[PDB]
Write a protein that holds these residues in place. Structure first.
Motif, PDB file in Angstrom:
ATOM      1  N   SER A   1       0.852  -1.189   0.000  1.00  0.00           N
ATOM      2  CA  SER A   1       0.000   0.000   0.000  1.00  0.00           C
ATOM      3  C   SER A   1       0.891   1.244   0.000  1.00  0.00           C
ATOM      4  N   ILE A   2       0.515   2.252  -0.781  1.00  0.00           N
ATOM      5  CA  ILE A   2       1.215   3.537  -0.762  1.00  0.00           C
ATOM      6  C   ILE A   2       1.247   4.166   0.665  1.00  0.00           C
TER       7      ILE A   2
ATOM      8  N   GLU B   1       0.052   0.692  -7.497  1.00  0.00           N
ATOM      9  CA  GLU B   1      -1.290   0.679  -6.892  1.00  0.00           C
ATOM     10  C   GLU B   1      -2.380   0.642  -7.964  1.00  0.00           C
ATOM     11  N   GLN B   2      -3.436  -0.134  -7.722  1.00  0.00           N
ATOM     12  CA  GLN B   2      -4.581  -0.218  -8.616  1.00  0.00           C
ATOM     13  C   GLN B   2      -5.516   0.902  -8.170  1.00  0.00           C
ATOM     14  N   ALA B   3      -5.415   2.070  -8.842  1.00  0.00           N
ATOM     15  CA  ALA B   3      -6.229   3.232  -8.518  1.00  0.00           C
ATOM     16  C   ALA B   3      -6.328   4.152  -9.719  1.00  0.00           C
ATOM     17  N   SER B   4      -7.311   5.073  -9.698  1.00  0.00           N
ATOM     18  CA  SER B   4      -7.463   6.057 -10.770  1.00  0.00           C
ATOM     19  C   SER B   4      -6.322   7.085 -10.647  1.00  0.00           C
TER      20      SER B   4
ATOM     21  N   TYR C   1     -10.033  -0.161   0.526  1.00  0.00           N
ATOM     22  CA  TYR C   1      -9.684  -0.929  -0.662  1.00  0.00           C
ATOM     23  C   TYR C   1     -10.787  -1.983  -0.850  1.00  0.00           C
TER      24      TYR C   1
ATOM     25  N   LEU D   1      -7.775   0.686  -4.655  1.00  0.00           N
ATOM     26  CA  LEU D   1      -7.941   1.792  -3.690  1.00  0.00           C
ATOM     27  C   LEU D   1      -9.169   2.592  -4.127  1.00  0.00           C
TER      28      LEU D   1
ATOM     29  N   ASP E   1     -12.663   6.591  -6.054  1.00  0.00           N
ATOM     30  CA  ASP E   1     -12.559   5.975  -7.376  1.00  0.00           C
ATOM     31  C   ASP E   1     -13.834   6.362  -8.150  1.00  0.00           C
TER      32      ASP E   1
ATOM     33  N   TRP F   1      -2.738  -5.636   7.390  1.00  0.00           N
ATOM     34  CA  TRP F   1      -4.003  -5.886   6.699  1.00  0.00           C
ATOM     35  C   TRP F   1      -4.918  -6.749   7.543  1.00  0.00           C
TER      36      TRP F   1
END
Lengths: 68, 113
Positions: free
Chosen positions: A2-3, A28-31, B37, B47, B61, B103
């Protein structure tokens, strides 16, 4: 990773922390909007006490990297 | 590993609501930035919402904008995710995160129809 967990080491050069930070954020999987927000919110916040002190006192990434 | 613990997941029909909570009672865990998340089985953990203390700036998002709201209760030390207008596509395990936290096990959200 995680960032949120990328934090500058006590003796880690600011440029090296910047590199790790951007690498993790790219992964990271994010916009792009969420990634941009993370850079403005975390980069200075997650810097070590020495660099946080300098950065708060001032801002572009190029001005931040020169000040540290 | 202060480990965060998610709750509030459930099974609801499309159009319904839920509210997820994230806490660690007895632990010092609220960081200046906190996030939610979500992860569907065999997919990347994405995220979806984050909040910053002080100015209470938030970011979302595109898929959750206008439907979900991230908030934090500083007195109770709980992070929330209000989820309105749920869709089958929202079905997933949801996880909260603070700087330096381990986590958690996540909470399952299942949306039918």
């Amino acid at each position: 990773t995680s960032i949120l967990d990328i934090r500058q080491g006590p003796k880690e050069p600011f440029r090296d922390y910047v590199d790790r930070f951007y690498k993790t954020l790219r992964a990271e999987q994010a916009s792009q909007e969420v990634k941009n927000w993370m850079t403005e919110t975390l980069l200075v916040q997650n810097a070590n006490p020495d660099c946080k002190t300098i950065l708060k006192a001032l801002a572009t990434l190029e001005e931040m990297m020169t000040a540290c | 590993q202060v480990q965060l613990v998610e709750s509030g997941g459930g099974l609801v029909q499309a159009g319904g609501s839920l509210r997820l909570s994230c806490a660690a009672s007895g632990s010092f865990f609220m960081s200046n930035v906190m996030a939610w998340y979500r992860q569907a089985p065999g997919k990347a953990r994405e995220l979806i919402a984050a909040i910053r203390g002080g100015d209470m700036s938030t970011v979302y998002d595109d898929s959750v904008k206008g439907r979900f709201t991230i908030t934090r209760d500083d007195d109770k030390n709980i992070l929330y995710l209000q989820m309105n207008d749920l869709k089958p596509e929202d079905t997933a395990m949801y996880y909260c995160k603070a700087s330096g936290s381990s986590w958690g096990q996540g909470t399952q959200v299942t949306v039918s129809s």
